[PDB]
DNA sequence: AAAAAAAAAAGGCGCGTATATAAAAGCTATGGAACGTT
C-alpha cells in the first residue's frame, strides 16, 4: 500500500456577493469569456494559478483546475480582484472547497471481477463500459475509481486526507484481488 | 402432407393479410434443424441427440420484411418449426444406409 | 484569394461578446501559403453564421 | 426489432406436446386427442 | 440490471451492448443502476463464458474454440497488458486462433459482427505476437 | 497594424491549447496586406 | 519523355465513450391549484 492518491484537481466556489454586468465583464476584462446562447457563465481564467472561474450572473464563482486547495483559493482571491479591477465593488466572500478529484496507480492489474464478486457490496466494474471500478468507501465518503491498469481514481471529496485515508483501507483488497 | 405444407402452405400463409399500416413480408426461409445451445453455440442437431437430450427437432424461420414509411400517402428471425422426421427438410431425408448407421438411426 | 494562413502562439486575452471573439496571441507566426512572426497580433472576428 | 418469436415457437411446441388443437389459453375448448406418443412397442405397432 | 444479474448468476454471458440493443437505457444511467443494484443484492445476500457465443456467431469449430479457451486461460497469467476490459482480449485471442488457421473471416467481418474496434484487435495483436510463446499446446 | 479582420467558425480548446478556425478575412501585417481563404489558429493560454 | 494536377486515406487525435465528484441558469418535468366549461 502506502500510495498517495494524488489530487488530480480541486474545486472551490467563492461568491462575490454582488451582481456584475455580464456584458461589461466581457468587453472590459482581458482573460474573460462569456457566451449567452450556450450558458450564462463567465469563463475567467488566470495564468497563475491556472484555474477557471465559473462566474455566473449571481456572483457565484467556481475555482476549478488547480491540484491543491490553496491554489484553488489563491486564484479565487486574484479572481475577485480582477473583477474589482473592472470597476465593480466585488468582494471576496464565501470561499469553500467544492471537490477534490484525484487518481493514483498501483503498478499491478487488479481482479475487478474478483473485487466485484466478494466486494460487490462495494465494487462495480464495467469492462464493456468503464475500464475502472467504482469502489465507494462509506467512511470516509470517498469513491475509489479502480482501474485494471491499477488506476485508483478518487474524488467526491473536500478533505485531502479523506482521499488518502480511504486508500490505505482499500489496498489489501486490491492485493486480495490482484494477479501478480 | 408435411412437405406440401412446409413448401407451399407456409409461404402462402404469409403472402396473405400480411402488410401492416408500412411493413411488408416477403420470402420465407427455413433452416435445417439446429439448437441454440444455452448461452453458447447454435449448431446442427441430429435426431439422436434430440431424443437423448429432450430437445426438439425444430428449425428456425426467417422471413424478409421491407419496412416502408408512408412517404406522402398520398432476414428476420421468427419462431421455430418442428420437423417431421425424414421430411424433405430433415437431415435424414436423403441419407443412405451406412450414414444412417453412423447416425445411430435404424434404417 | 487562395493563400492559407496559420497562426500559433500564446493567447493572453480572449474576449467574447455577442458572437464577437477577440484574441490577442502573443509571439505568433503568420504562415503565408513566408511565415511572419507577429509578437502582438490583434484578432477581432465575428460569427460568420 | 422486437418481434416475439417465442410466440410462434412456444405456441407450436406446446400444441404438439399436448395435442390440444386450439390456443395455449384454450384448455378444453381446444380440440384434443391429436399428437399421441408414437407407440413403439413393436415395430408393426 | 436484473437481467444481467440473472444471466451472470445462471452463468450466461451477456454484453451490456446486447442488453442495450434490447432496451434503450442510455447505458450510463444503466451503468449506475447496475452498480447500485449489484450493491443492493450483495447486501441482500469467471469471464470465459463469452467465447463460444462469438465463436458460434462467427461460425467457428470446437477445436478452434478450445484453442481460444486455452489462450484466454493463459491471458489472466500473461499481464503484459492482459485484459483491461478483457472483451478485447477474448476477441484478439479469437483473432489469434483464426490467423493460426486459414479461415476467410478477415478482421472486417469479425469486427462488424461483434461491434468491436478494427484497431484494438491489432493493438492487442502487437503484444499477442510476443505472447505467442506460451500458446502452443500440440 | 497586425489586425486580423476575419470571421471565426471553430475554436476548440483542450485545457491548455486553442484551435481556432478563421475564414474569409483580411490581415494587414506591418506594411503588408494579406487576405486568406481559410485560417487555422492554435494559440496557447498559459 | 516530362509537368502538373486529382484525389484516397492514414494516422492522429477528434471528443467520446464511462467513471467520479463539485458548482445553479435554459429547459423539463413534476406538483398544485380550483375555477373556467356542460
Amino acid at each position: 500500500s502506502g500510495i498517495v492518491p494524488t489530487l488530480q484537481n480541486i474545486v472551490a466556489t467563492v461568491t462575490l456577493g454582488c451582481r456584475l454586468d455580464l456584458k461589461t465583464v466581457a468587453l472590459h476584462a482581458r482573460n474573460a469569456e462569456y457566451n449567452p446562447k450556450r450558458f450564462a457563465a463567465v469563463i475567467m481564467r488566470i495564468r497563475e494559478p491556472k484555474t477557471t472561474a465559473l462566474i455566473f450572473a449571481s456572483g457565484k464563482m467556481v475555482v476549478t483546475g488547480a491540484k491543491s486547495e490553496d491554489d484553488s483559493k489563491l486564484a479565487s482571491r486574484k479572481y475577485a480582484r480582477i473583477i474589482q479591477k473592472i470597476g465593480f465593488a466585488a468582494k471576496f466572500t464565501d470561499f469553500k472547497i467544492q471537490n477534490i478529484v484525484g487518481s493514483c496507480d498501483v503498478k499491478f492489474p487488479i481482479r475487478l471481477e474478483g473485487l466485484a464478486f466478494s466486494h460487490g457490496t462495494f465494487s462495480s466494474y464495467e469492462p464493456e463500459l468503464f475500464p475502472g471500478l467504482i469502489y465507494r468507501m462509506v467512511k470516509p465518503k470517498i469513491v475509489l475509481l479502480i482501474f485494471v491498469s491499477g488506476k485508483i481514481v478518487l474524488t467526491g471529496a473536500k478533505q485531502r486526507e479523506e482521499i488518502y485515508q480511504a486508500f490505505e483501507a482499500i489496498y489489501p483488497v486490491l492485493s486480495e484481488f490482484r494477479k501478480m | 402432407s408435411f412437405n406440401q405444407f412446409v413448401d407451399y402452405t407456409l409461404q402462402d400463409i404469409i403472402c396473405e393479410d400480411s402488410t401492416l399500416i408500412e411493413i411488408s413480408f416477403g420470402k420465407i426461409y427455413v433452416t435445417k434443424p439446429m439448437v441454440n445451445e444455452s448461452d453458447g453455440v447454435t449448431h446442427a442437431l441430429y435426431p439422436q441427440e434430440a431424443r437423448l437430450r429432450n430437445l426438439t427437432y425444430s428449425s428456425g424461420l426467417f422471413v424478409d420484411v421491407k419496412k416502408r414509411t408512408y412517404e406522402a400517402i398520398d432476414k428476420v428471425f421468427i419462431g421455430r418449426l418442428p420437423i417431421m422426421l425424414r421430411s424433405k427438410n430433415c437431415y435424414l431425408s436423403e441419407a443412405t444406409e451406412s450414414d444412417l448407421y453412423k447416425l445411430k438411426e435404424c434404417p | 484569394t487562395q493563400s492559407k494562413l496559420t497562426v500559433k502562439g500564446n493567447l493572453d486575452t480572449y474576449g467574447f461578446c455577442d458572437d464577437v471573439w477577440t484574441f490577442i496571441v502573443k509571439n505568433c507566426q503568420v504562415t503565408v501559403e513566408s511565415v511572419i512572426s507577429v509578437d502582438k497580433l490583434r484578432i477581432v472576428a465575428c460569427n460568420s453564421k | 426489432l422486437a418481434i416475439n418469436a417465442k410466440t410462434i415457437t412456444s405456441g407450436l411446441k406446446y400444441a404438439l406436446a399436448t395435442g390440444n388443437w386450439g390456443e395455449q389459453k384454450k384448455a378444453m375448448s381446444s380440440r384434443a386427442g391429436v399428437s399421441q406418443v408414437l407407440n413403439r412397442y413393436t415395430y408393426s405397432s | 440490471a436484473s437481467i444481467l444479474i440473472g444471466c451472470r448468476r445462471a452463468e450466461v454471458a451477456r454484453t451490456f451492448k446486447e442488453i442495450q440493443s434490447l432496451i434503450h437505457v442510455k447505458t450510463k444511467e444503466f451503468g449506475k443502476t447496475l452498480n447500485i443494484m449489484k450493491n443492493i443484492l450483495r447486501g441482500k445476500s469467471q469471464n470465459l463464458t463469452y467465447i463460444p457465443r462469438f465463436c458460434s456467431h462467427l461460425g467457428l469449430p470446437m477445436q478452434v474454440t478450445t484453442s481460444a479457451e486455452y489462450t484466454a486461460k493463459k491471458c489472466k497469467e500473461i499481464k503484459e497488458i492482459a485484459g483491461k476490459s478483457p472483451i478485447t482480449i477474448a476477441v484478439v485471442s479469437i483473432y489469434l486462433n483464426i490467423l493460426l488457421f486459414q479461415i476467410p473471416i478477415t478482421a472486417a467481418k469479425v469486427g462488424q459482427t461483434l461491434q468491436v474496434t478494427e484497431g484494438t484487435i491489432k493493438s492487442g495483436y502487437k503484444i499477442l505476437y510476443e505472447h505467442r510463446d506460451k500458446l502452443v499446446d500440440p | 497594424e497586425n489586425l486580423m479582420l476575419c470571421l471565426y467558425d471553430k475554436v476548440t480548446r483542450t485545457k491548455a491549447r486553442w484551435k481556432c478556425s478563421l475564414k474569409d478575412g483580411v490581415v494587414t501585417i506591418n506594411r503588408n496586406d494579406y487576405t486568406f481563404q481559410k485560417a487555422q489558429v492554435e494559440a496557447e493560454w498559459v
Side-chain angles (χ1 to χ4, degrees), chain A residues 39-40 56 58 98-99 130 136 145 155-156:
Chain A
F39 185 40
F56 306 114
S58 45
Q98 283 309 120
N99 174 38
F130 180 47
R136 310 187 192 269
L145 324 201
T155 169

Side-chain angles (χ1 to χ4, degrees), chain E residues 112-132:
Chain E
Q112 72 173 9
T113 308
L114 282 66
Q115 282 84 345
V116 308
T117 348
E118 216 278 327
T120 311
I121 41 184
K122 295 214 140 303
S123 142
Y125 169 47
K126 187 160 191 175
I127 196 172
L128 212 59
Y129 211 104
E130 161 270 349
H131 283 337
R132 189 182 113 193

Side-chain angles (χ1 to χ4, degrees), chain B residues 38-42, chain E residues 11-13 53 56:
Chain B
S38 74
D39 190 45
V41 193
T42 280
Chain E
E11 320 114 11
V12 172
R53 337 193 64 260
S56 33

Side-chain angles (χ1 to χ4, degrees), chain B residues 4-81:
Chain B
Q4 162 82 10
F5 165 84
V6 86
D7 288 359
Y8 301 68
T9 295
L10 209 51
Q11 175 58 80
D12 309 11
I13 273 191
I14 308 303
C15 263
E16 212 189 62
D17 54 351
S18 64
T19 34
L20 284 198
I21 258 42
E22 219 68 20
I23 305 202
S24 77
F25 289 126
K27 210 156 168 54
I28 168 63
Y29 298 70
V30 198
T31 147
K32 293 292 194 159
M34 328 191 66
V35 296
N36 190 4
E37 184 121 344
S38 74
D39 190 45
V41 193
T42 280
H43 61 77
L45 163 84
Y46 283 123
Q48 197 50 39
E49 180 168 7
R51 276 193 259 265
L52 296 186
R53 307 176 49 177
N54 283 333
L55 310 183
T56 303
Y57 201 63
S58 61
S59 273
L61 283 190
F62 296 97
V63 56
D64 293 359
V65 301
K66 310 170 156 50
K67 149 265 129 191
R68 144 82 167 122
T69 186
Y70 304 52
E71 249 199 22
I73 302 177
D74 76 290
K75 184 170 188 181
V76 173
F77 179 80
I78 146 69
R80 214 167 220 166
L81 175 64

Side-chain angles (χ1 to χ4, degrees), chain A residues 50-84:
Chain A
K50 182 169 186 155
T51 70
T52 306
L54 297 187
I55 322 177
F56 306 114
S58 45
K60 290 306 173 55
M61 192 277 300
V62 194
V63 201
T64 175
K67 300 285 182 188
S68 56
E69 300 77 352
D70 183 77
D71 284 2
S72 194
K73 179 171 52 57
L74 168 62
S76 348
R77 306 177 180 274
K78 302 181 182 181
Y79 273 150
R81 188 55 200 169
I82 307 177
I83 290 291
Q84 299 168 7

Side-chain angles (χ1 to χ4, degrees), chain A residues 108-109 111 113 116-129 131 134 136 147-149 179-180, chain E residues 8-9 14-17 27-28 31-32 34-35 38-39 42-43 46 50 76 79 82-87:
Chain A
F108 66 89
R111 313 191 68 164
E113 181 63 33
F117 209 81
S118 165
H119 294 245
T121 24
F122 338 91
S123 330
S124 178
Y125 184 25
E126 297 188 71
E128 283 166 4
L129 216 51
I134 302 304
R136 310 187 192 269
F147 275 95
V148 191
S149 69
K179 314 181 185 303
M180 298 281 172
Chain E
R8 305 309 188 85
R9 293 300 171 245
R14 313 279 18 183
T15 300
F16 285 150
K17 319 202 184 195
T27 312
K28 193 171 210 165
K32 303 187 186 179
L34 70 91
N35 164 40
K38 138 195 295 199
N39 311 331
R42 249 320 156 288
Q46 52 180 35
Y50 281 95
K76 180 171 76 181
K79 52 139 91 315
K84 173 58 83 56
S85 72
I87 297 89

